[PDB]
Amino acid sequence: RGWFDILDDWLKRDRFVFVGWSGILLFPCAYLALGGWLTGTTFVTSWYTHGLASSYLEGCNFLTVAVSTPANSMGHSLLLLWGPEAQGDFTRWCQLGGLWTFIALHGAFGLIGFMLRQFEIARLVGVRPYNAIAFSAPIAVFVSVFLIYPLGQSSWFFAPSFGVAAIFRFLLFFQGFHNWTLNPFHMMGVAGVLGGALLCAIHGATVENTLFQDGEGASTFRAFNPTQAEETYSMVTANRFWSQIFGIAFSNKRWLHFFMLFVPVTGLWMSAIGVVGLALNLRSYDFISQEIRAAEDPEFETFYTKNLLLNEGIRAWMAPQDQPHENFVFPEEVLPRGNAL
Amino acid sequence: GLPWYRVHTVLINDPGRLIAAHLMHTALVAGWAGSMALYELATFDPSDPVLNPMWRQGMFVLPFMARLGVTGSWSGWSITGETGIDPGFWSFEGVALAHIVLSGLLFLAACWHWVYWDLELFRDPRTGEPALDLPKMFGIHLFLAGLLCFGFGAFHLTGLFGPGMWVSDPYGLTGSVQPVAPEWGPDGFNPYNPGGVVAHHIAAGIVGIIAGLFHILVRPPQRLYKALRMGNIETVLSSSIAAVFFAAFVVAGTMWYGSATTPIELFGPTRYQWDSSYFQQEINRRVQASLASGATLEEAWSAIPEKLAFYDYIGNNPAKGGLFRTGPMNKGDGIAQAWKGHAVFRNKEGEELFVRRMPAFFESFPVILTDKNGVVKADIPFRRAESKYSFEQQGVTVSFYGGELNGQTFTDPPTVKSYARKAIFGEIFEFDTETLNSDGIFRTSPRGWFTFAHAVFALLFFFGHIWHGARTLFRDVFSGIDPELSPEQVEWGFYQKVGDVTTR
Amino acid sequence: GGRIPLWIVATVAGMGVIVIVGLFFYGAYAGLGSSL
Amino acid sequence: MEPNPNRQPVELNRTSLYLGLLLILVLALLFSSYFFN
Amino acid sequence: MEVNQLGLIATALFVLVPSVFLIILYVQTESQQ
Amino acid sequence: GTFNFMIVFQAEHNILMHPFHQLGVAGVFGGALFCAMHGSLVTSSLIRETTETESANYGYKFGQEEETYNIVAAHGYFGRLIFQYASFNNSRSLHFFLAAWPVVGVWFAALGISTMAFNLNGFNFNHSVIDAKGNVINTWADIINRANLGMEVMHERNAHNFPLDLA
Amino acid sequence: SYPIFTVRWVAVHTLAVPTIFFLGAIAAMQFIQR
Amino acid sequence: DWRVLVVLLPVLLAAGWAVRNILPYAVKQVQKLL
Amino acid sequence: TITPSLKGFFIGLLSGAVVLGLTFAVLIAISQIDKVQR
Amino acid sequence: TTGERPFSDIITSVRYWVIHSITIPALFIAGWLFVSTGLAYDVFGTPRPDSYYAQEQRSIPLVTDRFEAKQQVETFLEQLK
Amino acid sequence: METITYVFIFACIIALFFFAIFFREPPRIT
Amino acid sequence: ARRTWLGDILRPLNSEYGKVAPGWGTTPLMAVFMGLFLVFLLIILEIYNSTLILDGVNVSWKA
Ligand code: CLA
Ligand code: CLA
Ligand code: CLA
Ligand code: CLA
Ligand code: CLA
Ligand SMILES: CCCCCCCCCCCCCCCC(=O)OC[C@H](COP(=O)(O)OC[C@@H](O)CO)OC(=O)CCCCCCCCCCCCCCC
Ligand SMILES: CC1=C(/C=C/C(C)=C/C=C/C(C)=C/C=C/C=C(C)/C=C/C=C(C)/C=C/C2=C(C)CCCC2(C)C)C(C)(C)CCC1
Ligand SMILES: CC1=C(/C=C/C(C)=C/C=C/C(C)=C/C=C/C=C(C)/C=C/C=C(C)/C=C/C2=C(C)CCCC2(C)C)C(C)(C)CCC1
Ligand code: OEX
Ligand SMILES: [Cl-]
Ligand SMILES: [Cl-]
Ligand SMILES: [Fe+2]
Ligand SMILES: [Mg+2]
């Protein structure tokens, strides 16, 4: 019972918001990430890094505000406030996009603090640490998208800017430049997300519709008691319903709930790997056999060749303003267009 | 019985068979390295290190042999293309043979250790249970690691007993294996300084010797022993995987950004050298130095080496490839045969135009020609009806200086447009697309492929760290929570401190 | 302890939220960001 | 030599067979287009 | 179509290798007592 | 063809800027989150019924009457991960929330498409921010519009004879 | 009988104090003209 | 810069007013903890 | 010499140590004053 | 159940609202004045509606040099006068 | 060969559906 | 278990399983080295990053 054990006593007190040792990392890093985002979206411009207004103070709404990435000439600079770019000037640091790296780094260490908190509480309450393990998927996504992706690219400029429309641009950029929908790792991510949402909806509806009558109310929530040993719904009835509707059904509740962990976690991990490839421009952009055939046969058309024409439109129309460090002047006659439009 | 994903857990309390499984893994990795090297040797074309180097040929292990000194073949060639040198035993074939023989010897040792699993050395002498003193094992292995790290730096890399390492000039023109002196200043932490690599292995190896001695002699604190579960071998696996993902993220970054350990003559240029126009500026510098001294434009550009012009071409950028565009870079654009020479574009008014280069993001890019102040003077238009800057309208011609088309001038607009579509890629080269059935579609270099594998593997290894670390610290609840879990422990307001029964 | 009834608190707090968000939607049609 | 006591039987039930074969065949259905390119 | 010449064997082994791994493990499970 | 439908739909309707698609995204992201959350929390609180050399799923028998996990322990964990009143202690309320969140969101996503069918499109903030002189100050919404224009002008590149794509 | 300043008090005020400051700032922004 | 006083003027006059009403009860919480 | 970014490094190192040192001194001090009842 | 006072008890008490009917409007008015005095522009460097461009400037003042970026912004700001 | 491959895998999936539904391990109440 | 010639030589090196030092031991020394290692990693990170620029340290292929 030295000073360490006395400090360990206080950090793990049963209070309203648990602290723990992880709370030393989680709480300041998460609050600065959140507070940095709310600060930038309320007050900070993107005029010098992107040529964009991006705060409420400039006139943007909630959908259009962002803490935008630094200028492409920053490279992968950490953009520390005391670093050689800002040199301690907070105002210049904000104008250089120093808030973006502030949010991304405090957010990264905050996420590390959150998984440590999951591990710490699970160890203290005596449960298995599967919630910490499932949280590795959001960590893999944040690390691949906001860190590994721009680190493979020219600068932090091409990471997502922390904002709603800014994120939508990032989606459209990945379509037009990376053809990211064609990527099988993204497709595995889509199956994990939509499968997990299916599993969320299907499991919740099945439980709620195979409930045992454990009370007289027509509003059935009161008939559950948190200390009951018994199942509140009929696994046998649920199993027979789905076996006859759909052909298969869960018969093991433990496997069912593991599969609910597995599906969206595996999906997000799969999507992270595809983005790691896109950090190097290792895209699933084309199918070579279709390109050889289309180049020699001008009647050969698929939805895939149609999507590449859309991709070429996206690149030529968006690049001069989306990449204003390149100083793209595309004269109007060079622009790919269809007839009339 | 055991589920399929837990079959290897039979080794957890069996040090003899853990060693056997590790020996078999080591036999497989060493056998891969030999068989990979023999495959590469069977396919590598050594005849042109200027325009067909190893990094154009999908060579993966060949640069790793070349980085540390192995440059010759028993068949008589070297990777720098020099003639008539003798490599001794340690050629590329001799490395590959050494790895194969080592693979077989490790296989036999794996068999022995698998059969003779029940050795007395693995037993605790006070209980007769299987017991490994993992803290002392760490100090022994750290001591051995530091000895080898020191020896690699002090003897191999310095040339004192050993070949040295691959070093090159800033433009990757004149690289060779050379002995490297250690840099003990702050420039030893410059990743582009080879002398810092020598001083690292000397200093860190000495530190590894001292720390290994410490860990041999000093027992763990019981606070650290109990908290890190130092009697459970899975704690070592968890932290080893953590160290291993850290190192893989490091090697991915230094491959992608370039360092003294990732030479462009071995792995290809970086994407950042295209981004910053690193080779184009040195090409233009040398041309202006010649033109200031009275060389003509033909003479100034004919003095640029083909190897330097080849780096200034986007088909050597490691960021132009595709995930399923498989194989060597030569499978894409073809085998580079010759520099065509530098294209100079001029309008009918005689003013020089400049083709806007393709950035690495763009699978396709329009052809736009600007003057020296960035104003657009010519282009290849999409819609033609209101076009004002067509090559026909502006009378655009192209002249070549240096290379194959030196002195030649072209004026017919299809021919001038076609070289302009090539000039978006940088310097224009003549390719052999027929030998490999080259499809014309850019592929990444070994620098690109190494970076992708090692970043993906490092990311997946982060899951393994989390998984095995969770398995270590929560070993008591791995098969489930205590069925007599006190609800007071998990209900609020019973214990002062969470999960402490003494605080009730 | 319990001097102002919680339904009064919730109603006034819920109405001030409406007023402030309502001002934000008003500001979408006036001044900065309104395109005029 | 006496048997190794660390040995354990291995299982894979039928549902796990069906799940794994579903996973392998769907992954092959997904990736085969990219393997053919 | 001019497809990858290794694509057929890459697909065939991608199926057959882990499929037979599961078949081996399943059948030896059923033959247990 | 699905991806072609999506890209053209964004070009013509700006679906990303429609709040019903955004509610739809919150449905599926939330559904995937809550799937992983409910799966992990139940798996974390499974009652020990098996040894180390067996799958924990064998600890559950089909049709058994006792619950196979400790919901009080799971609530005790999750109520300490966030705070106590953010965590469900009622499994019926929990499972209704698991049904209700993805379903309502996907309902809204369906009404997104179905009302963009009648060309009530996502939010248009093109040229919404204007300086003191009148210069357009671009936002991220104007960058979205530049991408939308490139999709618009290229889609069905032979099908339009007149300058507006009216359906 | 209860305390007044706890960790929970700090956690509440680190969010609520800047939130009310920001809402006043954003309200003022609705009256700026170009 | 006169405005840093103006922006902090209500923040100051709120804290000192809140700590005026809470000082008889903030001392009693400090006393039983001490 | 001490370049400006080397001075910036020492400022960033000291500022971090001050933030870590003040926080741990506050957390230790509160822990010693409000102990557990065992 | 962790010892702190319930939120329903606090926000319904008169003493909470005696304190907070001053503190809550004071923080709101302080935020209002941070914008209305114009301090938010000076602290954050955000352009006012008349200071995005010079009077005949159509070009965006994009930062193009990493280590002279602080000086470029300052130069861009001196170009507005 | 490509079309054969894709149809083959598809037919194996559909066969797997048949065995997974009609030759499943029967869920047993115990 | 099987005694061997090499096994009996290596025997002292695998004899002190579970042997610990009392209490905190050399933990405060270890934390000092971890702190120095963290600072060392930050130095080499910021040199490579161009955040820390030192005289005579040109982080470029030009060297
Ligand atoms: C757990 C809390 C935590 C963590 C992990 C971080 C982490 C970070 N902060 Mg944040 N920050 C925090 C709390 C935290 N912060 C708080 C509470 C505030 C409000 C004061 C801030 C305000 C803040 C600002 C304004 C900035 C950061 C920045 C950063 C990043 C760089 C920090 C750095 O390089 O210093 C290095 C310091 C250390 C690593 C401490 C070393 C301790 C060693 C082990 C002991 C040795 C010290 C030695 C004795 C000192 C002697 C000096 C002498 C030699 C001259 C890093 C991600 C920067 C950023 O976000 O970049 C965009 C930045 O600009 N932080
Ligand atoms: C017996 C000695 C021996 C020697 C001299 C070689 C020599 C070689 N190997 Mg072979 N190899 C060996 C055994 C050996 N090998 C064994 C046993 C295996 C099976 C594991 C292999 C598997 C193998 C593969 C797969 C490959 C090689 C390759 C090579 C060539 C390049 C080496 C290289 O780039 O490594 C680089 C080595 C490092 C970067 C070492 C990193 C050390 C880490 C960072 C230590 C981290 C932990 C450490 C303990 C921390 C504490 C340190 C302390 C000092 C403080 C070189 C000819 C390459 C090749 O060209 O094949 C044809 C290659 O691809 N080898
Ligand atoms: C004077 C003696 C001396 C000299 C000249 C060197 C020289 C060097 N050391 Mg060495 N070193 C020495 C002594 C010396 N060392 C001693 C005594 C030790 C203790 C045993 C070390 C331990 C050590 C380590 C651990 C490392 C070096 C490295 C290096 C190289 C640094 C440049 C570089 O490429 O970094 C590039 C590496 C970095 C900039 C480190 C990045 C740290 C990361 C960012 C931490 C975050 C990790 C986390 C997983 C990231 C996840 C997020 C991500 C996905 C975005 C350089 C060769 C580094 C190296 O090997 O590079 C190839 C390296 O990692 N040294
Ligand atoms: C670190 C690993 C590594 C790297 C970076 C390289 C790099 C290279 N190899 Mg080598 N090689 C390696 C290991 C590696 N190799 C191994 C282990 C073998 C034995 C199989 C080989 C055998 C080999 C041969 C025979 C050849 C090469 C060639 C090459 C070159 C071209 C690469 C290419 O086209 O890949 C293409 C990469 C892909 C198409 C990516 C694969 C993606 C997989 C299939 C996706 C998996 C998805 C997964 C199943 C989903 C899981 C979901 C689930 C978790 C739910 C390149 C330099 C070629 C060369 O040019 O040599 C001269 C060549 O002919 N390699
Ligand atoms: C040094 C690396 C290392 C080592 C020695 C181990 C060792 C172990 N792991 Mg761990 N693990 C690791 C890294 C490692 N892991 C990584 C990187 C991940 C993230 C991918 C994991 C995630 C993980 C999980 C989720 C589980 C384990 C489990 C285990 C235990 C049983 C393994 C088994 O029976 O699988 C047998 C494997 C098969 C029968 C077939 C696997 C085929 C894979 C999916 C694809 C083919 C792999 C290919 C052949 C090899 C390429 C190697 C690559 C590195 C290049 C064993 C202690 C299990 C455990 O803890 O049990 C109690 C367990 O459930 N591991
Ligand atoms: C009651 C069960 C209903 C099922 C709950 C599941 C859905 C819950 C919805 C989400 C929460 C909604 C609000 C609950 C609505 C509700 O049920 O209220 C009840 C709850 C407690 O009420 P009282 O405090 O009056 O009751 C205390 C009891 O002891 C009664 O004596 O109110 C709150 O917790 C107020 C929330 C303020 C939040 C202060 C947070 C401070 C910051 C903490 C953030 C840090 C943690 C982050 C860790 C990284
Ligand atoms: C960055 C930085 C920092 C920090 C700061 C911070 C931390 C801040 C915070 C801040 C904050 C913390 C703020 C807040 C804000 C708030 C707001 C802005 C709010 C709003 C709200 C609203 C608007 C609402 C709405 C809604 C929802 C959401 C849902 C439901 C419905 C309703 C409608 C109600 C420092 C100095 C350290 C350093 C330098 C940098
Ligand atoms: C016995 C003996 C011998 C022999 C030996 C030998 C001959 C060996 C060989 C060996 C070898 C020959 C081996 C090899 C190995 C290999 C391996 C181990 C591989 C692996 C692979 C993998 C792992 C891969 C994977 C993948 C794929 C498939 C696809 C893509 C992705 C990846 C890359 C992942 C001698 C006489 C000398 C001596 C005495 C005895
Ligand atoms: O079809 Mn199918 O996508 Ca409905 O917009 Mn009008 O049309 Mn055509 O154009 Mn745009
Ligand atoms: Cl289309
Ligand atoms: Cl029409
Ligand atoms: Fe459930
Ligand atoms: Mg307005």
Q: Quickly tell me which residue has 């909470």 as its tokens.
A: J16
Evaluate the CA torsion angle K9, K14, K19, K24 in order and state its sign. Answer: positive
How buried is residue B400: exposed, middle or buried, by Cβ count under 10 Å (0-12/13-18/19+)?
buried
CA distance C17 to J26: 17
Closest CA to A114 of A43, A223, A25, A5: A25
Helix, coil or strand: residue B80: coil
Q: How far is the CA of B364 from the centre of ligand 9 (A)?
A: 25
Take residue H24 and report the two structure tokens written for it. 């008889």
Q: How far is the CA of B363 from the centre of ligand 2 (A)?
A: 37
Interface test with A, best of C32, C35, C36 (most A CBs within 10 A): C32
Residues whose CB is less than 8 angstroms from the CB of residue I9 and which lie 6 or more positions away in sequence, other chains included: A82, L43, L46, L51, L52
Identify the architecture of domain I1-38 in CATH. Up-down Bundle (1.20)
| Ligand-binding site membership of B342 (annotated) | no
Instruction: Check if the beta carbon of residue A96 is closer than 8 Å to that of residue J63.
Output: yes
What is the biggest distance separating any 2 CA atoms in chain A, rounded to whole angstroms?
Answer: 82
B177 and B97 belong to one structural domain: yes
Closest CA to L52 of J12, B54, J71, I11: I11
- Nearest ligand 1 atom to the CA of I13 is 37
Could you tell me whether strands B409-410 and B429-432 are parallel, antiparallel, or unpaired per DSSP bridges? unpaired
- Type and span of the H or E element at B234: helix B233-257
D37 in contact with E at a CB cutoff of 8 Å? Answer: yes
Where are the strands (E) in B60-110, listed by range? none
Take residue B360 and report the two structure tokens written for it. 């690495």
Instruction: Check if the beta carbon of residue F68 is closer than 8 Å to that of residue F50.
Output: no
Interface test with A, best of G15, G22, G30, G34 (most A CBs within 10 A): G22
CA distance B182 to A216: 84
- Type and span of the H or E element at B398: strand B397-401
Q: Quickly tell me which residue has 């200086």 as its tokens.
A: B401
Residues whose CB is less than 8 angstroms from the CB of residue I29 and which lie 6 or more positions away in sequence, other chains included: none
CA dihedral K6, K7, K9, K13 (to 10 degrees): 130
What approach was used to elucidate this structure? cryo-EM
Residues of J in Cβ contact (< 8 Å) with C4 = 12-14, 17
Residues whose CB is less than 8 angstroms from the CB of residue B197 and which lie 6 or more positions away in sequence, other chains included: B153, B157, B165, B180, B260, B261
Residues whose CB is less than 8 angstroms from the CB of residue J12 and which lie 6 or more positions away in sequence, other chains included: C1, C2, C3, C4, C5, C6, C9
C-alpha distances (whole Å) from C14 to each of B21, C7, G16 are 66, 10, 16
CA distance A84 to J70: 9
B324 lines ligand 4 (CB under 6 A): yes
E27 in contact with A at a CB cutoff of 8 Å? Answer: no
Domain count along chain A: 1
Helix, coil or strand: residue B426: strand
Q: How far is the CA of G33 from the centre of ligand 13 (A)?
A: 8
Alpha helix (H) ranges present in B193-232?
Answer: 194-217, 222-227
Q: Give the neighbours of chain H: at least 3 Cβ pairs within 8 Å.
A: G, I, J
Residues whose CB is less than 8 angstroms from the CB of residue J71 and which lie 6 or more positions away in sequence, other chains included: none
F92 lines ligand 6 (CB under 6 A): no
Where in chain J are the domains? 7-79
User: What is the CB neighbour count within 10 angstroms for residue B121?
Assistant: 21
G to J CB pairs, distance under 8 Å: 52
**Header resolution in angstroms:** 2.1
Q: How far is the CA of A150 from the centre of ligand 10 (A)?
A: 30
Q: How far is the CA of B34 from the centre of ligand 8 (A)?
A: 8
The CATH H-level superfamily of J7-79 is Photosystem II cytochrome b559, alpha subunit (1.20.5.860)
> Bridge partners of B398?
B345, B410
Instruction: Check if the beta carbon of residue A305 is closer than 8 Å to that of residue A311.
Output: no
Take residue F121 and report the two structure tokens written for it. 């499109």
Instruction: Check if the beta carbon of residue A241 is closer than 8 Å to that of residue A181.
Output: no
Write the DSSP symbol of residue G5.
-
Instruction: Give residue A236's domain range.
Output: 1-341
Residues whose CB is less than 8 angstroms from the CB of residue I12 and which lie 6 or more positions away in sequence, other chains included: A80, A82, A83
Radius of gyration, CA atoms only, chain C: 15
Take residue H21 and report the two structure tokens written for it. 């009403």
Amino acid identity at B24: M
Q: Indicate contact of I with B: 3+ CB pairs under 8 A.
A: yes
Residue whose CA is at the smallest distance from ligand 4 atom 63:
B327
Closest CA to A236 of F64, F57, K23, F99: F64
Residues of F in Cβ contact (< 8 Å) with J50 = 131-133
**Would you mind telling me the total number of residues written for chain L in this entry?**
63
Instruction: Read off φ and ψ for residue A283, nearest 5 degrees.
Output: -95, 155
Instruction: Give residue B104's domain range.
Output: 1-270+444-504
B33 and B17 belong to one structural domain: yes
Instruction: Check if the beta carbon of residue F68 is closer than 8 Å to that of residue F46.
Output: yes
User: What is the CB neighbour count within 10 angstroms for residue F72?
Assistant: 17
Write the DSSP symbol of residue L34.
H
Are B485 and F70 an interchain contact pair (Cβ–Cβ within 8 Å)? yes
C-alpha distances (whole Å) from F46 to each of A202, A265, F42, L50 are 21, 19, 6, 50
CA distance F25 to A193: 10
Instruction: Check if the beta carbon of residue H10 is closer than 8 Å to that of residue J29.
Output: yes
B to L CB pairs, distance under 8 Å: 114
CA distance B442 to B315: 6
User: Long-range contact list for I9-13, CB < 8 A, 24+ apart?
Assistant: I9/A82, I9/L43, I9/L46, I9/L51, I9/L52, I11/A82, I11/A88, I12/A80, I12/A82, I12/A83, I13/L39, I13/L42
Amino acid identity at A98: G
Interface test with G, best of A11, A17, A64 (most G CBs within 10 A): A17
Closest CA to A29 of A140, A126, A111: A111
CA distance B454 to B462: 12
I34 in contact with H at a CB cutoff of 8 Å? Answer: yes
Q: Indicate contact of D with C: 3+ CB pairs under 8 A.
A: no
Our CA-based measurement puts residue D15 at a distance from the nearest CA of chain B, in whole angstroms, of 13
Are L52 and I5 an interchain contact pair (Cβ–Cβ within 8 Å)? yes
Write the DSSP symbol of residue I6.
H
Closest CA to A66 of A74, A77, A52, A55: A55
Amino acid identity at A132: A
DSSP string, chain F: -HHHHHHHHHHHH-GGG-HHHHHHHHHHHHHHHHHHHHHHHHHHTBB--S-TTS-GGGGS-TT-SB-SB-HHHHHHHHHHHS-GGGS---HHHHHHHHHHHHHHHHHHHHHHHHHHTTT--S---TT--B-SS--B---HHHHHHHHHHHHHHHTTTTS--SS----
**Would you mind telling me the total number of residues written for chain A in this entry?**
341
Nearest CA in chain A to E4: A289
Write the Ramachandran bin of A51: left for phi over 0, alpha for psi from -120 to 50, otherwise beta: left
Q: How far is the CA of C30 from the centre of ligand 13 (A)?
A: 5
Our CA-based measurement puts residue A42 at a distance from the nearest CA of chain I, in whole angstroms, of 26
User: What is the CB neighbour count within 10 angstroms for residue B294?
Assistant: 8
CA distance A93 to F125: 28
CA distance B375 to B353: 10
CA distance A306 to B99: 50
Residues of J in Cβ contact (< 8 Å) with G10 = none
Nearest CA in chain J to G8: J4
Alpha helix (H) ranges present in B258-377?
Answer: 264-267, 271-275, 278-292, 297-302, 306-311, 330-333
Instruction: Read off φ and ψ for residue B322, nearest 5 degrees.
Output: -150, 150
Q: Which ligand is nearest to the CA of A136?
A: 5
Are I37 and B503 an interchain contact pair (Cβ–Cβ within 8 Å)? yes
Amino acid identity at A149: Y
The residues of A whose Cβ lies within 8 A of any Cβ of D are 184, 187-188, 284, 287-289
Closest CA to A178 of A280, A268, A273: A280
**Would you mind telling me the total number of residues written for chain E in this entry?**
33
B34 lines ligand 4 (CB under 6 A): no
J78 in contact with F at a CB cutoff of 8 Å? Answer: no
Residues of K in Cβ contact (< 8 Å) with D25 = 9, 12-13, 16
Our CA-based measurement puts residue J2 at a distance from the nearest CA of chain F, in whole angstroms, of 9
- Type and span of the H or E element at B336: strand B335-339
Our CA-based measurement puts residue D20 at a distance from the nearest CA of chain B, in whole angstroms, of 11
Take residue B382 and report the two structure tokens written for it. 């999409």
CA distance L40 to L45: 8
Residues whose CB is less than 8 angstroms from the CB of residue A241 and which lie 6 or more positions away in sequence, other chains included: A206, A210, A249
Residues of D in Cβ contact (< 8 Å) with A287 = 33, 37
CA distance B240 to G16: 44
- Type and span of the H or E element at B176: strand B176-178
Among B147, B157, B250, B459, which residue has the most ligand 3 atoms within 8 Å of its CB, making it the best to mutate?
B250
B218 and B289 belong to one structural domain: no
Helix, coil or strand: residue G2: coil
Take residue F16 and report the two structure tokens written for it. 């990303």
C-alpha distances (whole Å) from B42 to each of B46, B62, F76, K16 are 11, 12, 63, 43
CA distance A172 to E22: 41
Instruction: Check if the beta carbon of residue A333 is closer than 8 Å to that of residue B386.
Output: yes
CA distance B115 to B106: 14
Helix, coil or strand: residue C16: helix
Closest CA to J34 of J23, J24, J44, J20: J44
Of chain H, the end-to-end C-alpha distance in Å amounts to: 42
Residues of A in Cβ contact (< 8 Å) with D34 = 184, 284
CA distance F72 to F74: 5
Instruction: Check if the beta carbon of residue A125 is closer than 8 Å to that of residue F87.
Output: no
Q: Point out the domain boundary residue: B443, B461, B481.
A: B443
Where are the strands (E) in J1-81, listed by range? none
Closest CA to A158 of A20, A319, A37: A319
**Residues 6 to 25 of I: which have CB under 8 A from any A CB?**
8-9, 11-12, 15, 23
Closest CA to A320 of J65, B271, F143: F143
CA distance L58 to L63: 7
Among B54, B60, B324, which residue has the most ligand 4 atoms within 8 Å of its CB, making it the best to mutate?
B60
Take residue B430 and report the two structure tokens written for it. 């003549």
The per-residue b/e assignment along A2-17, b for 16 or more CB within 10 angstroms, e otherwise, is eeeebbbbbbbbbbbb
Closest CA to A321 of A169, A155, A160: A169
Amino acid identity at B56: R
Residues of D in Cβ contact (< 8 Å) with A184 = 30-31, 34
Instruction: Check if the beta carbon of residue J3 is closer than 8 Å to that of residue B494.
Output: no
CA distance A180 to A283: 7
Q: Quickly tell me which residue has 């719904």 as its tokens.
A: A233
Residues whose CB is less than 8 angstroms from the CB of residue C6 and which lie 6 or more positions away in sequence, other chains included: J8, J11, J12
- Nearest ligand 4 atom to the CA of A269 is 54
User: Long-range contact list for L41-45, CB < 8 A, 24+ apart?
Assistant: L42/I13, L43/B189, L43/I9, L44/B189
What is the biggest distance separating any 2 CA atoms in chain D, rounded to whole angstroms?
Answer: 54
**Would you mind telling me the total number of residues written for chain F in this entry?**
167
Instruction: Check if the beta carbon of residue B17 is closer than 8 Å to that of residue B395.
Output: no
Residues of J in Cβ contact (< 8 Å) with B493 = 1-3
- Nearest ligand 5 atom to the CA of B244 is 1
CA distance B393 to B347: 9
CA distance D32 to E7: 7
Instruction: Check if the beta carbon of residue B133 is closer than 8 Å to that of residue L14.
Output: yes
- Type and span of the H or E element at B353: strand B352-355
Q: What is the 3-state secondary structure (H, E, C) of chain A?
A: CCHHHHHHHHHCECCCCCCCCHHHHHHHHHHHHHHHHHHHHHHCCECCCCCECCCCCCCCCCCCCEECCCCHHHCCCCCCCCCCCCCCCHHHHHHCCHHHHHHHHHHHHHHHHHHHHHHHHHHHHCCCCHHHHHCHHHHHHHHHHHHHHHHHCCCHHHCCCEEHHHHHHHHHHHHHHHCHHHCHHHHHHHHHHHHHHHHHHHHHHHHHHCECCCCCCCCHHHHCCCCCCECCECHHHHHHHHHHHCCCCCCCHHHHHHHHHHHHHHHHHHHHHHHHHHCCCCECCCCHHHHHHHHHCCCCCCHHHHHHHHHHHHHHHHHHHHCCCCCCCCCHHHCCCCCCC
Angle at L24 between CA B244 and CA A4, to 5 degrees: 95
CA distance A253 to J32: 55
Instruction: Check if the beta carbon of residue A280 is closer than 8 Å to that of residue B319.
Output: yes
Where in chain L are the domains? 1-51
CA distance J4 to G11: 13
Amino acid identity at B13: N
Instruction: Read off φ and ψ for residue J14, nearest 5 degrees.
Output: -75, -35
CA distance B365 to B356: 9
User: What is the CB neighbour count within 10 angstroms for residue B426?
Assistant: 24
Take residue C21 and report the two structure tokens written for it. 């968000």
Radius of gyration, CA atoms only, chain D: 18
Q: At what angle do helices F19-44 and F71-81 cross, to 10 degrees?
A: 130
Angle at L40 between CA L35 and CA L41, to 5 degrees: 100
Instruction: Check if the beta carbon of residue A200 is closer than 8 Å to that of residue F32.
Output: yes
Instruction: Check if the beta carbon of residue A118 is closer than 8 Å to that of residue A105.
Output: no
